[PDB]
Design a binder for this molecule. Sequence first.
Ligand code: IHE
Length: 215
Amino acid sequence: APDSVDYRKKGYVTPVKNQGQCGSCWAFSSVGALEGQLKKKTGKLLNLSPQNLVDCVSENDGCGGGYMTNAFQYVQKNRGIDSEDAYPYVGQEESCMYNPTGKAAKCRGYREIPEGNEKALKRAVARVGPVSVAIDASLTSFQFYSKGVYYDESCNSDNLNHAVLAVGYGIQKGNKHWIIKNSWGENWGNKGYILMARNKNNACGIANLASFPKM
Ligand SMILES: *C(#N)C1=NC([N][C]2[C][C][C][C][C]2)=C2N=[C]N([C][C]N3[C][C]N([C])[C][C]3)C2=N1
């Protein structure tokens, strides 16, 4: 596996979004990983529908939270997910709409990365593509991050309360990091992204609830 991987440079990552006034971070993390696979398989980079997931993954809690594994299972059993153009984001839960048209992407299930194993996470990012992960984002230091490789001793590996997308990994001035795509708009962090410490004992629980869809 390479020392460095950044899917933004290959054109495998769509523009940063803003989940608005809804706790749908999990829907954005799930579509980001599906967008990566679609691009890999077809060459087209398209915005898929987080709203489709918010409204229809009944096993999840809409704007109240949810799991990415549940979202991948729903796409598999439903035969696809709509594009953002076909099922636009409105930022509140609505009834699950059915678009008779074709779905924009499909998946054959998912895989979970072994709990706490950052080395397996690194290999999966290198070989598969962007990976959905969950972290503890409760700290003021995370919320107001601006630059550098983020590391905070108070981060709690067992308090997973936010979902994001790992789109690469690398090293900056001697510090190994993970390149993380957030869904709080481009004004947050560094143009919507954050570099999080890599190989510093699963800091913030980065490798504790990671998964990717099979396409
Ligand atoms: C996002 N946005 C989001 N996600 C979750 N839960 C998931 C986090 C990642 C792993 C799978 C579960 C949310 N649960 C609740 N909320 C609303 C906002 N939170 C309310 C509780 N406080 C303590 C933290 C913020 C979620 N939002």
